Ligand binder design. Sequence first.
Ligand SMILES: [Mg+2]
Ligand SMILES: [Mg+2]
Ligand SMILES: [Mg+2]
Ligand SMILES: [Mg+2]
Ligand SMILES: [Mg+2]
Ligand SMILES: [Mg+2]
Ligand SMILES: [Mg+2]
Ligand SMILES: [Mg+2]
Ligand SMILES: [Mg+2]
Ligand SMILES: [Mg+2]
Ligand SMILES: [Mg+2]
Ligand SMILES: [Mg+2]
Ligand SMILES: [Mg+2]
Ligand SMILES: [Mg+2]
Ligand SMILES: [Mg+2]
Ligand SMILES: [Mg+2]
Ligand SMILES: [Mg+2]
Ligand SMILES: [Mg+2]
Ligand SMILES: [Mg+2]
Ligand SMILES: [Mg+2]
Ligand SMILES: [Mg+2]
Ligand SMILES: [Mg+2]
Ligand SMILES: [Mg+2]
Ligand SMILES: [Mg+2]
Ligand SMILES: [Mg+2]
Ligand SMILES: [Mg+2]
Ligand SMILES: [Mg+2]
Ligand SMILES: [Mg+2]
Ligand SMILES: [Mg+2]
Ligand SMILES: [Mg+2]
Ligand SMILES: [Mg+2]
Ligand SMILES: [Mg+2]
Ligand SMILES: [Mg+2]
Ligand SMILES: [Mg+2]
Ligand SMILES: [Mg+2]
Ligand SMILES: [Mg+2]
Ligand SMILES: [Mg+2]
Ligand SMILES: [Mg+2]
Ligand SMILES: [Mg+2]
Ligand SMILES: [Mg+2]
Ligand SMILES: [Mg+2]
Ligand SMILES: [Mg+2]
Ligand SMILES: [Mg+2]
Ligand SMILES: [Mg+2]
Ligand SMILES: [Mg+2]
Ligand SMILES: [Mg+2]
Ligand SMILES: [Mg+2]
Ligand SMILES: [Mg+2]
Ligand SMILES: [Mg+2]
Ligand SMILES: [Mg+2]
Ligand SMILES: [Mg+2]
Ligand SMILES: [Mg+2]
Ligand SMILES: [Mg+2]
Ligand SMILES: [Mg+2]
Ligand SMILES: [Mg+2]
Ligand SMILES: [Mg+2]
Ligand SMILES: [Mg+2]
Ligand SMILES: [Mg+2]
Ligand SMILES: [Mg+2]
Ligand SMILES: [Mg+2]
Ligand SMILES: [Mg+2]
Ligand SMILES: [Mg+2]
Ligand SMILES: [Mg+2]
Ligand SMILES: [Mg+2]
Ligand SMILES: [Mg+2]
Ligand SMILES: [Mg+2]
Ligand SMILES: [Mg+2]
Ligand SMILES: [Mg+2]
Ligand SMILES: [Mg+2]
Ligand SMILES: [Mg+2]
Ligand SMILES: [Mg+2]
Ligand SMILES: [Mg+2]
Ligand SMILES: [Mg+2]
Ligand SMILES: [Mg+2]
Ligand SMILES: [Mg+2]
Ligand SMILES: [Mg+2]
Ligand SMILES: [Mg+2]
Ligand SMILES: [Mg+2]
Ligand SMILES: [Mg+2]
Ligand SMILES: [Mg+2]
Ligand SMILES: [Mg+2]
Ligand SMILES: [Mg+2]
Ligand SMILES: [Mg+2]
Ligand SMILES: [Mg+2]
Ligand SMILES: [Mg+2]
Ligand SMILES: [Mg+2]
Ligand SMILES: [Mg+2]
Ligand SMILES: [Mg+2]
Ligand SMILES: [Mg+2]
Ligand SMILES: [Mg+2]
Ligand SMILES: [Mg+2]
Ligand SMILES: [Mg+2]
Ligand SMILES: [Mg+2]
Ligand SMILES: [Mg+2]
Ligand SMILES: [Mg+2]
Ligand SMILES: [Mg+2]
Ligand SMILES: [Mg+2]
Ligand SMILES: [Mg+2]
Ligand SMILES: [Mg+2]
Ligand SMILES: [Mg+2]
Ligand SMILES: [Mg+2]
Ligand SMILES: [Mg+2]
Ligand SMILES: [Mg+2]
Ligand SMILES: [Mg+2]
Ligand SMILES: [Mg+2]
Ligand SMILES: [Mg+2]
Ligand SMILES: [Mg+2]
Ligand SMILES: [Mg+2]
Ligand SMILES: [Mg+2]
Ligand SMILES: [Mg+2]
Ligand SMILES: [Mg+2]
Ligand SMILES: [Mg+2]
Ligand SMILES: [Mg+2]
Ligand SMILES: [Mg+2]
Ligand SMILES: [Mg+2]
Ligand SMILES: [Mg+2]
Ligand SMILES: [Mg+2]
Ligand SMILES: [Mg+2]
Ligand SMILES: [Mg+2]
Ligand SMILES: [Mg+2]
Ligand SMILES: [Mg+2]
Ligand SMILES: [Mg+2]
Ligand SMILES: [Mg+2]
Ligand SMILES: [Mg+2]
Ligand SMILES: [Mg+2]
Ligand SMILES: [Mg+2]
Ligand SMILES: [Mg+2]
Ligand SMILES: [Mg+2]
Ligand SMILES: [Mg+2]
Ligand SMILES: [Mg+2]
Ligand SMILES: [Mg+2]
Ligand SMILES: [Mg+2]
Ligand SMILES: [Mg+2]
Ligand SMILES: [Mg+2]
Ligand SMILES: [Mg+2]
Ligand SMILES: [Mg+2]
Ligand SMILES: [Mg+2]
Ligand SMILES: [Mg+2]
Ligand SMILES: [Mg+2]
Ligand SMILES: [Mg+2]
Ligand SMILES: [Mg+2]
Ligand SMILES: [Mg+2]
Ligand SMILES: [Mg+2]
Ligand SMILES: [Mg+2]
Ligand SMILES: [Mg+2]
Ligand SMILES: [Mg+2]
Ligand SMILES: [Mg+2]
Ligand SMILES: [Mg+2]
Ligand SMILES: [Mg+2]
Ligand SMILES: [Mg+2]
Ligand SMILES: [Mg+2]
Ligand SMILES: [Mg+2]
Ligand SMILES: [Mg+2]
Ligand SMILES: [Mg+2]
Ligand SMILES: [Mg+2]
Ligand SMILES: [Mg+2]
Ligand SMILES: [Mg+2]
Ligand SMILES: [Mg+2]
Ligand SMILES: [Mg+2]
Ligand SMILES: [Mg+2]
Ligand SMILES: [Mg+2]
Ligand SMILES: [Mg+2]
Ligand SMILES: [Mg+2]
Ligand SMILES: [Mg+2]
Ligand SMILES: [Mg+2]
Ligand SMILES: [Mg+2]
Ligand SMILES: [Mg+2]
Ligand SMILES: [Mg+2]
Ligand SMILES: [Mg+2]
Ligand SMILES: [Mg+2]
Ligand SMILES: [Mg+2]
Ligand SMILES: [Mg+2]
Ligand SMILES: [Mg+2]
Ligand SMILES: [Mg+2]
Ligand SMILES: [Mg+2]
Ligand SMILES: [Mg+2]
Ligand SMILES: [Mg+2]
Ligand SMILES: [Mg+2]
Ligand SMILES: [Mg+2]
Ligand SMILES: [Mg+2]
Ligand SMILES: [Mg+2]
Ligand SMILES: [Mg+2]
Ligand SMILES: [Mg+2]
Ligand SMILES: [Mg+2]
Ligand SMILES: [Mg+2]
Ligand SMILES: [Mg+2]
Ligand SMILES: [Mg+2]
Ligand SMILES: [Mg+2]
Ligand SMILES: [Mg+2]
Ligand SMILES: [Mg+2]
Ligand SMILES: [Mg+2]
Ligand SMILES: [Mg+2]
Ligand SMILES: [Mg+2]
Ligand SMILES: [Mg+2]
Ligand SMILES: [Mg+2]
Ligand SMILES: [Mg+2]
Ligand SMILES: [Mg+2]
Ligand SMILES: [Mg+2]
Ligand SMILES: [Mg+2]
Ligand SMILES: [Mg+2]
Ligand SMILES: [Mg+2]
Ligand SMILES: [Mg+2]
Ligand SMILES: [Mg+2]
Ligand SMILES: [Mg+2]
Ligand SMILES: [Mg+2]
Ligand SMILES: [Mg+2]
Ligand SMILES: [Mg+2]
Ligand SMILES: [Mg+2]
Ligand SMILES: [Mg+2]
Ligand SMILES: [Mg+2]
Ligand SMILES: [Mg+2]
Ligand SMILES: [Mg+2]
Ligand SMILES: [Mg+2]
Ligand SMILES: [Mg+2]
Ligand SMILES: [Mg+2]
Ligand SMILES: [Mg+2]
Ligand SMILES: [Mg+2]
Ligand SMILES: [Mg+2]
Ligand SMILES: [Mg+2]
Ligand SMILES: [Mg+2]
Ligand SMILES: [Mg+2]
Ligand SMILES: [Mg+2]
Ligand SMILES: [Mg+2]
Ligand SMILES: [Mg+2]
Ligand SMILES: [Mg+2]
Ligand SMILES: [Mg+2]
Ligand SMILES: [Mg+2]
Ligand SMILES: [Mg+2]
Ligand SMILES: [Mg+2]
Ligand SMILES: [Mg+2]
Ligand SMILES: [Mg+2]
Ligand SMILES: [Mg+2]
Ligand SMILES: [Mg+2]
Ligand SMILES: [Mg+2]
Ligand SMILES: [Mg+2]
Ligand SMILES: [Mg+2]
Ligand SMILES: [Mg+2]
Ligand SMILES: [Mg+2]
Ligand SMILES: [Mg+2]
Ligand SMILES: [Mg+2]
Ligand SMILES: [Mg+2]
Lengths: 202, 149, 59, 64
Amino acid sequence: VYQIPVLSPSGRRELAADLPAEINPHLLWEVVRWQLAKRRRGTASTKTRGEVAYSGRKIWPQKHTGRARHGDIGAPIFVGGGVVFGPKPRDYSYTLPKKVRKKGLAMAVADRAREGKLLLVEAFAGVNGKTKEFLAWAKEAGLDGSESVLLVTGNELVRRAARNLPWVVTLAPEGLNVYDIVRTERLVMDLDAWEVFQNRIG
Amino acid sequence: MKLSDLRPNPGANKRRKRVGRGPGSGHGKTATRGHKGQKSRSGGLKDPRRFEGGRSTTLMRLPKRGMQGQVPGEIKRPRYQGVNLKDLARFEGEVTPELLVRAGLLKKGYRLKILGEGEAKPLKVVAHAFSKSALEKLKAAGGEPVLLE
Amino acid sequence: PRLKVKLVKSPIGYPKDQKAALKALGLRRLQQERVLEDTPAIRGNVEKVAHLVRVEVVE
Amino acid sequence: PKMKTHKGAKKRVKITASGKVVAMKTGKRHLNWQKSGKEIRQKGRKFVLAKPEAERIKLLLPYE
RNA sequence: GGGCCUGACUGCGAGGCCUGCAAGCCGAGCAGGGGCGAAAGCCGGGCCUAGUGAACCGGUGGUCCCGUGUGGAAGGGCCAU
RNA sequence: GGAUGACCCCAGGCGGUAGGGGAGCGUUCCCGAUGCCGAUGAAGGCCGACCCGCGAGGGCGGCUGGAGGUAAGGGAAGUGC
RNA sequence: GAGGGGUUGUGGCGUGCCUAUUGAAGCAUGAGCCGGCGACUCACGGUCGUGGGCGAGCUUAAGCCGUUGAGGCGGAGGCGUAGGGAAACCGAGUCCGAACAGGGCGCAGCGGCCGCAAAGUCCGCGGCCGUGGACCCGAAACCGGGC
RNA sequence: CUGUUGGGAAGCAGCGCCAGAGAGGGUGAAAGCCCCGUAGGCGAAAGGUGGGGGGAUAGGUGAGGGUACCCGAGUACCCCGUGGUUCGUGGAGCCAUGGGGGAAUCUGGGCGGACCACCGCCUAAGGCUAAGUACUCCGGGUGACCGAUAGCGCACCAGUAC
RNA sequence: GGGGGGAACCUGGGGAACUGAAACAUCUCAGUACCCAGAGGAGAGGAAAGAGAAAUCGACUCCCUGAGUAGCGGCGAGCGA
Ligand SMILES: [Mg+2]
Ligand SMILES: [Mg+2]
Ligand SMILES: [Mg+2]
Ligand SMILES: [Mg+2]
Ligand SMILES: [Mg+2]
Ligand SMILES: [Mg+2]
Ligand SMILES: [Mg+2]
Ligand SMILES: [Mg+2]
Ligand SMILES: [Mg+2]
Ligand SMILES: [Mg+2]
Ligand SMILES: [Mg+2]
Ligand SMILES: [Mg+2]
Ligand SMILES: [Mg+2]
Ligand SMILES: [Mg+2]
Ligand SMILES: [Mg+2]
Ligand SMILES: [Mg+2]
Ligand SMILES: [Mg+2]
Ligand SMILES: [Mg+2]
Ligand SMILES: [Mg+2]
Ligand SMILES: [Mg+2]
Ligand SMILES: [Mg+2]
Ligand SMILES: [Mg+2]
Ligand SMILES: [Mg+2]
Ligand SMILES: [Mg+2]
Ligand SMILES: [Mg+2]
Ligand SMILES: [Mg+2]
Ligand SMILES: [Mg+2]
Ligand SMILES: [Mg+2]
Ligand SMILES: [Mg+2]
Ligand SMILES: [Mg+2]
Ligand SMILES: [Mg+2]
Ligand SMILES: [Mg+2]
Ligand SMILES: [Mg+2]
Ligand SMILES: [Mg+2]
Ligand SMILES: [Mg+2]
Ligand SMILES: [Mg+2]
Ligand SMILES: [Mg+2]
Ligand SMILES: [Mg+2]
Ligand SMILES: [Mg+2]
Ligand SMILES: [Mg+2]
Ligand SMILES: [Mg+2]
Ligand SMILES: [Mg+2]
Ligand SMILES: [Mg+2]
Ligand SMILES: [Mg+2]
Ligand SMILES: [Mg+2]
Ligand SMILES: [Mg+2]
Ligand SMILES: [Mg+2]
Ligand SMILES: [Mg+2]
Ligand SMILES: [Mg+2]
Ligand SMILES: [Mg+2]
Ligand SMILES: [Mg+2]
Ligand SMILES: [Mg+2]
Ligand SMILES: [Mg+2]
Ligand SMILES: [Mg+2]
Ligand SMILES: [Mg+2]
Ligand SMILES: [Mg+2]
Ligand SMILES: [Mg+2]
Ligand SMILES: [Mg+2]
Ligand SMILES: [Mg+2]
Ligand SMILES: [Mg+2]
Ligand SMILES: [Mg+2]
Ligand SMILES: [Mg+2]
Ligand SMILES: [Mg+2]
Ligand SMILES: [Mg+2]
Ligand SMILES: [Mg+2]
Ligand SMILES: [Mg+2]
Ligand SMILES: [Mg+2]
Ligand SMILES: [Mg+2]
Ligand SMILES: [Mg+2]
Ligand SMILES: [Mg+2]
Ligand SMILES: [Mg+2]
Ligand SMILES: [Mg+2]
Ligand SMILES: [Mg+2]
Ligand SMILES: [Mg+2]
Ligand SMILES: [Mg+2]
Ligand SMILES: [Mg+2]
Ligand SMILES: [Mg+2]
Ligand SMILES: [Mg+2]
Ligand SMILES: [Mg+2]
Ligand SMILES: [Mg+2]
Ligand SMILES: [Mg+2]
Ligand SMILES: [Mg+2]
Ligand SMILES: [Mg+2]
Ligand SMILES: [Mg+2]
Ligand SMILES: [Mg+2]
Ligand SMILES: [Mg+2]
Ligand SMILES: [Mg+2]
Ligand SMILES: [Mg+2]
Ligand SMILES: [Mg+2]
Ligand SMILES: [Mg+2]
Ligand SMILES: [Mg+2]
Ligand SMILES: [Mg+2]
Ligand SMILES: [Mg+2]
Ligand SMILES: [Mg+2]
Ligand SMILES: [Mg+2]
Ligand SMILES: [Mg+2]
Ligand SMILES: [Mg+2]
Ligand SMILES: [Mg+2]
Ligand SMILES: [Mg+2]
Ligand SMILES: [Mg+2]
Ligand SMILES: [Mg+2]
Ligand SMILES: [Mg+2]
Ligand SMILES: [Mg+2]
Ligand SMILES: [Mg+2]
Ligand SMILES: [Mg+2]
Ligand SMILES: [Mg+2]
Ligand SMILES: [Mg+2]
Ligand SMILES: [Mg+2]
Ligand SMILES: [Mg+2]
Ligand SMILES: [Mg+2]
Ligand SMILES: [Mg+2]
Ligand SMILES: [Mg+2]
Ligand SMILES: [Mg+2]
Ligand SMILES: [Mg+2]
Ligand SMILES: [Mg+2]
Ligand SMILES: [Mg+2]
Ligand SMILES: [Mg+2]
Ligand SMILES: [Mg+2]
Ligand SMILES: [Mg+2]
Ligand SMILES: [Mg+2]
Ligand SMILES: [Mg+2]
Ligand SMILES: [Mg+2]
Ligand SMILES: [Mg+2]
Ligand SMILES: [Mg+2]
Ligand SMILES: [Mg+2]
Ligand SMILES: [Mg+2]
Ligand SMILES: [Mg+2]
Ligand SMILES: [Mg+2]
Ligand SMILES: [Mg+2]
Ligand SMILES: [Mg+2]
Ligand SMILES: [Mg+2]
Ligand SMILES: [Mg+2]
Ligand SMILES: [Mg+2]
Ligand SMILES: [Mg+2]
Ligand SMILES: [Mg+2]
Ligand SMILES: [Mg+2]
Ligand SMILES: [Mg+2]
Ligand SMILES: [Mg+2]
Ligand SMILES: [Mg+2]
Ligand SMILES: [Mg+2]
Ligand SMILES: [Mg+2]
Ligand SMILES: [Mg+2]
Ligand SMILES: [Mg+2]
Ligand SMILES: [Mg+2]
Ligand SMILES: [Mg+2]
Ligand SMILES: [Mg+2]
Ligand SMILES: [Mg+2]
Ligand SMILES: [Mg+2]
Ligand SMILES: [Mg+2]
Ligand SMILES: [Mg+2]
Ligand SMILES: [Mg+2]
Ligand SMILES: [Mg+2]
Ligand SMILES: [Mg+2]
Ligand SMILES: [Mg+2]
Ligand SMILES: [Mg+2]
Ligand SMILES: [Mg+2]
Ligand SMILES: [Mg+2]
Ligand SMILES: [Mg+2]
Ligand SMILES: [Mg+2]
Ligand SMILES: [Mg+2]
Ligand SMILES: [Mg+2]
Ligand SMILES: [Mg+2]
Ligand SMILES: [Mg+2]
Ligand SMILES: [Mg+2]
Ligand SMILES: [Mg+2]
Ligand SMILES: [Mg+2]
Ligand SMILES: [Mg+2]
Ligand SMILES: [Mg+2]
Ligand SMILES: [Mg+2]
Ligand SMILES: [Mg+2]
Ligand SMILES: [Mg+2]
Ligand SMILES: [Mg+2]
Ligand SMILES: [Mg+2]
Ligand SMILES: [Mg+2]
Ligand SMILES: [Mg+2]
Ligand SMILES: [Mg+2]
Ligand SMILES: [Mg+2]
Ligand SMILES: [Mg+2]
Ligand SMILES: [Mg+2]
Ligand SMILES: [Mg+2]
Ligand SMILES: [Mg+2]
Ligand SMILES: [Mg+2]
Ligand SMILES: [Mg+2]
Ligand SMILES: [Mg+2]
Ligand SMILES: [Mg+2]
Ligand SMILES: [Mg+2]
Ligand SMILES: [Mg+2]
Ligand SMILES: [Mg+2]
Ligand SMILES: [Mg+2]
Ligand SMILES: [Mg+2]
Ligand SMILES: [Mg+2]
Ligand SMILES: [Mg+2]
Ligand SMILES: [Mg+2]
Ligand SMILES: [Mg+2]
Ligand SMILES: [Mg+2]
Ligand SMILES: [Mg+2]
Ligand SMILES: [Mg+2]
Ligand SMILES: [Mg+2]
Ligand SMILES: [Mg+2]
Ligand SMILES: [Mg+2]
Ligand SMILES: [Mg+2]
Ligand SMILES: [Mg+2]
Ligand SMILES: [Mg+2]
Ligand SMILES: [Mg+2]
Ligand SMILES: [Mg+2]
Ligand SMILES: [Mg+2]
Ligand SMILES: [Mg+2]
Ligand SMILES: [Mg+2]
Ligand SMILES: [Mg+2]
Ligand SMILES: [Mg+2]
Ligand SMILES: [Mg+2]
Ligand SMILES: [Mg+2]
Ligand SMILES: [Mg+2]
Ligand SMILES: [Mg+2]
Ligand SMILES: [Mg+2]
Ligand SMILES: [Mg+2]
Ligand SMILES: [Mg+2]
Ligand SMILES: [Mg+2]
Ligand SMILES: [Mg+2]
Ligand SMILES: [Mg+2]
Ligand SMILES: [Mg+2]
Ligand SMILES: [Mg+2]
Ligand SMILES: [Mg+2]
Ligand SMILES: [Mg+2]
Ligand SMILES: [Mg+2]
Ligand SMILES: [Mg+2]
Ligand SMILES: [Mg+2]
Ligand SMILES: [Mg+2]
Ligand SMILES: [Mg+2]
Ligand SMILES: [Mg+2]
Ligand SMILES: [Mg+2]
Ligand SMILES: [Mg+2]
Ligand SMILES: [Mg+2]
Ligand SMILES: [Mg+2]
Ligand SMILES: [Mg+2]
Ligand SMILES: [Mg+2]
Ligand SMILES: [Mg+2]
Ligand SMILES: [Mg+2]
Ligand SMILES: [Mg+2]
Ligand SMILES: [Mg+2]
Ligand SMILES: [Mg+2]
């Protein structure tokens, strides 16, 4: 078990948590790959020599002109003809195994835990919507903006307050994902979100 | 662990074989197809799993055998999938086709039949059929067979 | 699981009904060893003469 | 799209448990009067196809 | 040349020859029931090597295996040709 | 050897078409990047007898050019004539 | 500005490139020259190998919900867990057979319950096969409807 | 905001400030706070829409017993010739129908793959019915989509010149 | 009231061939291309003289699965619920 520092008005707490011990870099890479692959738009397209505007007339006779034999000017050997193996619209998504993405999620959170960069918060004192409020809170909480932070919390007023900062990413715990965990240098969570995370890896 | 640390394990993502791309590569000019003939062609070659240059094929000179059937097709009948005693050891108390399908052992829509590889545990097991050695082993280890339909 | 049952203590001097259990279990010789089922019937006889019997569970 | 089962193979052959291919002996469909019982008897049994030919027909039978 | 006979068997087949495949060839021995022989044994056609034709489609004699709600039937399968 | 490429010593192999295998270079694009290089001059162009790399190539310098370019690490292809 | 760069008088050596071929400098093919365009791909299925997850199990599909470059739910189903037989049927066996015969096809981790490994299966990647126009270009023709 | 280098500051330096807004594009170079925007909010007299919410209207409505009146005709049905189905004449049903013959109204008729019996299923020869589905001339949003031989045939007075 | 138009999409009435079968005729391509008629913002379909074995289900359309299964097939190539 790791020991995760907790932040309370009632004082600097500690709490044991059951993150996995051994971390698999290749596995985390497989989840990030699959994350960034299934979001692809797949909108690259080209025109086959049959999808092109020209007519299928034979531009000149097969024999006895002294020029190369050609068919129609849609053939890809012509400028302005079709393109042989151009992109067609594609679905890059795939069903990465549920167990694997669950494992990576717990793994990526454990890496921040094993580093000292996982803070669990009780609540957010004054922050009720405004950036200046969350900023002030961040100063008390040791978050000065020198490091990037993944804020994971179901409180929307806290999410809107932090989200425009250039060093803060914003998530509801149902949106916890490993790519955003790895993007960031620190990880900050509600005890409400922490409970949610703990349920999703079980 | 930073984004720039995420790399695939050695060999996880090998690069492709790109032919017809110069002398240095080993694959220039003919793109490993050799020279002329069918099969060098785009689209070339009939399906080599079957075709044999025009002679009667290895498959087609073999004789047919057995019932292939006829329209209106398959005759619907009760189907038995057998499950071994060794597969039952994990359970306690009573064993049922329901419980057996959720374990992953029995397939849906298949009447149960207990087979006798392995030993018998004292279990009341409700199955559509038993082998001879399934009944004997079972009803001799405290087991409780239950034929049904 | 089955029952590797070995007779390791002479019945001589013990009540007759315990000597019958050995006959039920088939133990007719010292150090003799029989493998039986774990039937609650068979078990109880083995439990009766537990002090005369070495028992290993098999399977 | 998905491959189609070669029904000539399906009707002529069987893949065993270890992945051999088995077929009926050829040569007793007719013309059998002057054949010994030794020929008629041995040709009534299945046989294992040579490996090169076996691996071909097995690809024709992809969902067995 | 003669006598008695039908092994010109049925159910299998160790092991080989040959061979790209598929075929082709030889085969001891075990069992069933036989032929000949006092017997040892021999006999699964012919001194041997040519006298031949894969599959598909159908015919006929068996078998009683499937039989499209059920019992039958139609029709197939299997064995032989 | 030292200990798993930590580098060193000693030895042998290293012509090559079809073709098999291996390891790299470069191009476009994405993550890295709310970053970093950039008018004290981006990309591209023109030179170089300089440096690195077996090579494909990569640097550096001078001129041109005048607004972009983009690392270590990975990802994807309309990727080299 | 003990070195380099340009030039080339003389001497030595010396049969273009590509393609096709048994064999080309070949008096066999192609190319005036330059720049740009130009040919092994994608989907789905298969089959091997490979990087990981899980392992007698593995995995979801369409959808539903959430996000709006967030991810989750969904077990229907699919593959595997047993084979043999035309089948009925039997089953670690089964089929042929009269057979308890003979044969065909089948049947069973590494270290101290704990740890690793592994059937299998899922996904990624790569080689190759099937279906597609399937490496690119090229017919003479065939058909339909119109001019 | 100021200084600064510079043709120009958004660069560099100094001291600030906003953020439910740090998506993006501009501005003389590289700008959160100059501009246009962005987050978050507001907006229709008129036309269109209105599948949502409300209201009307049409419409909707028992039990026994008796009776045996009615229940879709050149139809079912059979035969000839075909089509559809996975079904290529197959043991060929089923659905459809060009030809011939030609019923019955429930105790009637069709079907469950020749056929027959039993057992079931259904109620032909009248009509209509949202939604879930398809498509992209049109608008908008977004691209590990092109960037002027590319991307539409056309970024440009292009279905033009010719 | 109709007439005519509308990129694709829809239904109906007609309906090829190259090609594949490494020839070709059944078969394939394919009820596709195309022609024609009609319809719309969709269209077709639709309220069991159904399924088909469940003593069951309950209009129709569309998706996933069933399943390349059942079968069809010069039992060839292939086709395919
Ligand atoms: Mg396009
Ligand atoms: Mg194009
Ligand atoms: Mg086309
Ligand atoms: Mg065209
Ligand atoms: Mg065209
Ligand atoms: Mg045109
Ligand atoms: Mg044309
Ligand atoms: Mg034309
Ligand atoms: Mg033409
Ligand atoms: Mg010519
Ligand atoms: Mg010329
Ligand atoms: Mg020319
Ligand atoms: Mg020319
Ligand atoms: Mg020409
Ligand atoms: Mg052409
Ligand atoms: Mg021209
Ligand atoms: Mg064309
Ligand atoms: Mg073009
Ligand atoms: Mg092409
Ligand atoms: Mg092309
Ligand atoms: Mg892929
Ligand atoms: Mg960041
Ligand atoms: Mg932010
Ligand atoms: Mg933000
Ligand atoms: Mg963000
Ligand atoms: Mg958020
Ligand atoms: Mg978000
Ligand atoms: Mg970090
Ligand atoms: Mg390589
Ligand atoms: Mg790749
Ligand atoms: Mg490639
Ligand atoms: Mg090369
Ligand atoms: Mg070269
Ligand atoms: Mg190579
Ligand atoms: Mg080579
Ligand atoms: Mg060449
Ligand atoms: Mg090559
Ligand atoms: Mg090759
Ligand atoms: Mg070749
Ligand atoms: Mg090749
Ligand atoms: Mg060639
Ligand atoms: Mg050659
Ligand atoms: Mg050759
Ligand atoms: Mg060539
Ligand atoms: Mg040749
Ligand atoms: Mg050749
Ligand atoms: Mg050739
Ligand atoms: Mg060749
Ligand atoms: Mg090839
Ligand atoms: Mg070959
Ligand atoms: Mg070639
Ligand atoms: Mg071609
Ligand atoms: Mg082909
Ligand atoms: Mg060809
Ligand atoms: Mg021939
Ligand atoms: Mg079958
Ligand atoms: Mg004693
Ligand atoms: Mg005594
Ligand atoms: Mg005593
Ligand atoms: Mg007593
Ligand atoms: Mg298909
Ligand atoms: Mg066949
Ligand atoms: Mg078979
Ligand atoms: Mg024959
Ligand atoms: Mg026969
Ligand atoms: Mg004959
Ligand atoms: Mg005979
Ligand atoms: Mg003979
Ligand atoms: Mg004989
Ligand atoms: Mg023989
Ligand atoms: Mg026989
Ligand atoms: Mg080989
Ligand atoms: Mg196969
Ligand atoms: Mg296969
Ligand atoms: Mg299957
Ligand atoms: Mg005689
Ligand atoms: Mg006699
Ligand atoms: Mg042999
Ligand atoms: Mg052989
Ligand atoms: Mg011979
Ligand atoms: Mg005998
Ligand atoms: Mg005898
Ligand atoms: Mg005698
Ligand atoms: Mg004797
Ligand atoms: Mg003998
Ligand atoms: Mg044939
Ligand atoms: Mg037959
Ligand atoms: Mg008969
Ligand atoms: Mg019947
Ligand atoms: Mg029967
Ligand atoms: Mg009867
Ligand atoms: Mg019967
Ligand atoms: Mg019969
Ligand atoms: Mg028959
Ligand atoms: Mg018959
Ligand atoms: Mg050396
Ligand atoms: Mg050596
Ligand atoms: Mg070499
Ligand atoms: Mg892009
Ligand atoms: Mg960026
Ligand atoms: Mg700078
Ligand atoms: Mg560029
Ligand atoms: Mg440059
Ligand atoms: Mg250089
Ligand atoms: Mg300079
Ligand atoms: Mg420059
Ligand atoms: Mg700019
Ligand atoms: Mg920039
Ligand atoms: Mg660059
Ligand atoms: Mg870059
Ligand atoms: Mg890199
Ligand atoms: Mg790819
Ligand atoms: Mg290309
Ligand atoms: Mg490459
Ligand atoms: Mg090149
Ligand atoms: Mg000099
Ligand atoms: Mg000189
Ligand atoms: Mg001179
Ligand atoms: Mg000279
Ligand atoms: Mg000379
Ligand atoms: Mg010369
Ligand atoms: Mg050259
Ligand atoms: Mg030539
Ligand atoms: Mg020549
Ligand atoms: Mg020449
Ligand atoms: Mg010449
Ligand atoms: Mg010359
Ligand atoms: Mg010439
Ligand atoms: Mg020539
Ligand atoms: Mg040439
Ligand atoms: Mg010229
Ligand atoms: Mg020219
Ligand atoms: Mg020139
Ligand atoms: Mg050029
Ligand atoms: Mg390839
Ligand atoms: Mg493609
Ligand atoms: Mg596959
Ligand atoms: Mg593969
Ligand atoms: Mg794999
Ligand atoms: Mg897994
Ligand atoms: Mg699961
Ligand atoms: Mg956002
Ligand atoms: Mg079987
Ligand atoms: Mg056996
Ligand atoms: Mg028998
Ligand atoms: Mg036996
Ligand atoms: Mg064996
Ligand atoms: Mg493992
Ligand atoms: Mg694995
Ligand atoms: Mg292959
Ligand atoms: Mg084509
Ligand atoms: Mg195609
Ligand atoms: Mg290919
Ligand atoms: Mg023709
Ligand atoms: Mg003709
Ligand atoms: Mg003609
Ligand atoms: Mg003509
Ligand atoms: Mg014509
Ligand atoms: Mg005409
Ligand atoms: Mg100034
Ligand atoms: Mg200023
Ligand atoms: Mg500057
Ligand atoms: Mg400043
Ligand atoms: Mg924003
Ligand atoms: Mg944007
Ligand atoms: Mg901006
Ligand atoms: Mg801007
Ligand atoms: Mg800047
Ligand atoms: Mg800007
Ligand atoms: Mg700006
Ligand atoms: Mg808004
Ligand atoms: Mg607004
Ligand atoms: Mg509003
Ligand atoms: Mg209402
Ligand atoms: Mg009502
Ligand atoms: Mg009423
Ligand atoms: Mg009626
Ligand atoms: Mg009517
Ligand atoms: Mg009427
Ligand atoms: Mg007639
Ligand atoms: Mg008829
Ligand atoms: Mg028909
Ligand atoms: Mg049909
Ligand atoms: Mg028909
Ligand atoms: Mg029919
Ligand atoms: Mg009629
Ligand atoms: Mg009446
Ligand atoms: Mg009735
Ligand atoms: Mg009636
Ligand atoms: Mg009817
Ligand atoms: Mg009828
Ligand atoms: Mg009937
Ligand atoms: Mg029915
Ligand atoms: Mg029936
Ligand atoms: Mg019905
Ligand atoms: Mg009707
Ligand atoms: Mg309607
Ligand atoms: Mg609708
Ligand atoms: Mg648009
Ligand atoms: Mg727009
Ligand atoms: Mg231009
Ligand atoms: Mg253009
Ligand atoms: Mg330009
Ligand atoms: Mg371009
Ligand atoms: Mg346009
Ligand atoms: Mg336009
Ligand atoms: Mg153009
Ligand atoms: Mg133009
Ligand atoms: Mg014009
Ligand atoms: Mg008109
Ligand atoms: Mg109209
Ligand atoms: Mg039609
Ligand atoms: Mg039509
Ligand atoms: Mg015609
Ligand atoms: Mg034809
Ligand atoms: Mg033809
Ligand atoms: Mg042909
Ligand atoms: Mg051909
Ligand atoms: Mg021909
Ligand atoms: Mg033809
Ligand atoms: Mg035809
Ligand atoms: Mg076609
Ligand atoms: Mg075709
Ligand atoms: Mg057709
Ligand atoms: Mg149509
Ligand atoms: Mg069309
Ligand atoms: Mg609609
Ligand atoms: Mg409608
Ligand atoms: Mg009604
Ligand atoms: Mg009705
Ligand atoms: Mg009803
Ligand atoms: Mg229905
Ligand atoms: Mg009911
Ligand atoms: Mg309903
Ligand atoms: Mg379907
Ligand atoms: Mg299945
Ligand atoms: Mg068919
Ligand atoms: Mg077909
Ligand atoms: Mg058909
Ligand atoms: Mg068809
Ligand atoms: Mg249908």
